[PDB]
Amino acid sequence: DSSDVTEVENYMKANYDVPNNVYFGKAEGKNVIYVSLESLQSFIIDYKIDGKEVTPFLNKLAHDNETFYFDNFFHQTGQGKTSDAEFMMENSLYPLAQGSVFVNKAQNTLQSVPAILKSKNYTSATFHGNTQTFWNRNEMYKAEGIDKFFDSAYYDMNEENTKNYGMKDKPFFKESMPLLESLPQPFYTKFITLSNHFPFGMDEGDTDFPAGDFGDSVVDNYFQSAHYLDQSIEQFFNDLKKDGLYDKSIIVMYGDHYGISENHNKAMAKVLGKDEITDYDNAQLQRVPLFIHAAGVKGEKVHKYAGDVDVAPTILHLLGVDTKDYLMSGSDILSKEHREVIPFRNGDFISPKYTKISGKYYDTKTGKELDESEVDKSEDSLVKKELEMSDKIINGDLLRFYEPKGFKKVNPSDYDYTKH
Ligand SMILES: [Mg+2]
Numbered sequence: 001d002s003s004d005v006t007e008v009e010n011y012m013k014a015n016y017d018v019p020n021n022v023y024f025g026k027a028e029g030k031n032v033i034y035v036s037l038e039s040l041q042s043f044i045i046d047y048k049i050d051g052k053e054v055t056p057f058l059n060k061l062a063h064d065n066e067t068f069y070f071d072n073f074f075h076q077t078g079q080g081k082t083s084d085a086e087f088m089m090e091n092s093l094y095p096l097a098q099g100s101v102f103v104n105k106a107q108n109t110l111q112s113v114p115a116i117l118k119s120k121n122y123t124s125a126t127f128h129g130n131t132q133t134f135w136n137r138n139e140m141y142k143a144e145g146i147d148k149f150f151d152s153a154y155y156d157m158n159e160e161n162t163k164n165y166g167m168k169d170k171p172f173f174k175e176s177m178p179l180l181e182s183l184p185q186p187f188y189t190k191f192i193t194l195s196n197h198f199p200f201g202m203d204e205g206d207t208d209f210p211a212g213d214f215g216d217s218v219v220d221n222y223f224q225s226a227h228y229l230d231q232s233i234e235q236f237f238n239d240l241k242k243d244g245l246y247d248k249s250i251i252v253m254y255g256d257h258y259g260i261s262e263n264h265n266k267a268m269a270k271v272l273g274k275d276e277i278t279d280y281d282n283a284q285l286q287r288v289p290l291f292i293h294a295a296g297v298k299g300e301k302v303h304k305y306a307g308d309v310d311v312a313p314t315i316l317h318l319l320g321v322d323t324k325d326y327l328m329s330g331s332d333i334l335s336k337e338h339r340e341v342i343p344f345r346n347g348d349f350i351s352p353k354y355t356k357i358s359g360k361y362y363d364t365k366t367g368k369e370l371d372e373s374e375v376d377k378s379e380d381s382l383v384k385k386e387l388e389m390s391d392k393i394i395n396g397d398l399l400r401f402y403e404p405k406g407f408k409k410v411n412p413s414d415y416d417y418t419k420h
Pocket of ligand 1: 039256
């Protein structure tokens with residue numbers, strides 16, 4: 001009921017991390033283009049096989065003088081995987097501890113970014129080369145206020161364009177251009193890639209890259225489909241620059257979650273030149289890349305620890321929108337006060353000081369195991385509370401009882417995603 005909002009609201013305001021005026025509003029008026037980079041982990045950035053770079057385009061962005069790149073950014077997903085990361089981008093709220101929030105909470109009342117942005121006249125659309133029913137997206141996007149859903153009905157699903165879950169990234173990005181250029185501006189858009197999906201085979205000759213030689217074909221083929229993903233982003237960027245949308249936009253790209261689980265530890269230790277992959281090393285491998293190119297704004301390679309729930313306020317702040325009145329779990333990464341103790345969905349966490357995995361603590365810098373006696377419990381408490389506040393919102397559908405100042409309530413029945 002209405003009184004349970006109070007405790008959550010008092011904590012969200014008691015922790016809000018205010019905006020950096022070096023950055024706040026500096027991208028006001030711009031389009032937003034999100035790209036979800038399927039199963040892409042940060043270890044891939046700058047990685048080479050036989051002296052050949054695996055992700056040369058993404059590497060250039062990582063090394064340029066203009067793009068924000070975050071090398072200590074972590075996925076915070078659970079069992080809803082791709083859609084768990086989408087939920088966090090739009091809501092700055094954690095997904096469910098078990099099962100999928102997209103599948104089970106699509107009737108919650110939400111106050112998403114695409115919905116916030118309506119009062120600034122943003123049209124919102126998702127692009128994805130698979131049916132709209134996948135991960136219950138067609139129900140959940142309506143709750144999120146997404147105006148348009150360009151699913152697989154809008155792509156040529158032939159022989160050579162289709163792999164496993166649907167469209168390959170290269171033709172998916174080509175075909176999305178006229179659809180994207182038809183959008184009244186300003187627009188807020190999501191591109192959900194498909195091609196870098198487990199077990200990571202790619203067809204010859206859709207890419208020319210060698211497979212690694214690590215004794216495991218899942219891991220061997222990862223590098224080939226990652227290289228293909230990288231060419232797709234390059235083409236997308238070239239096309240964004242032909243049509244003039246590159247200078248009119250904030251492009252935000254993120255790996256959605258890990259692609260390589262602990263079932264492949266034997267090969268991953270070879271990938272890393274290590275004897276074995278420990279619990280600690282695996283925690284380090286949950287880094288996913290985050291890139292933000294905000295046109296008109298000089299980006300920095302930022303090393304602050306951050307997670308998925310931090311993206312939405314970073315972006316909103318860049319657009320000049322004040323997030324103090326919203327119930328959001330995340331903290332603007334560009335903020336001076338930005339918190340760096342990063343929860344994982346299962347209650348583990350990572351921070352510059354500590355990595356905590358199944359109740360063990362390690363020194364984040366060195367991997368050295370720490371005994372419980374010498375650990376400051378204050379970080380663990382911050383984590384529990386951060387997760388708890390979010391869970392109260394989602395479990396009690398608390399946003400029915402909260403009205404932020406700008407916000408006009410979303411009516412899911414407004415949206416229709418049938419292709420005519
Ligand atoms: Mg995924």
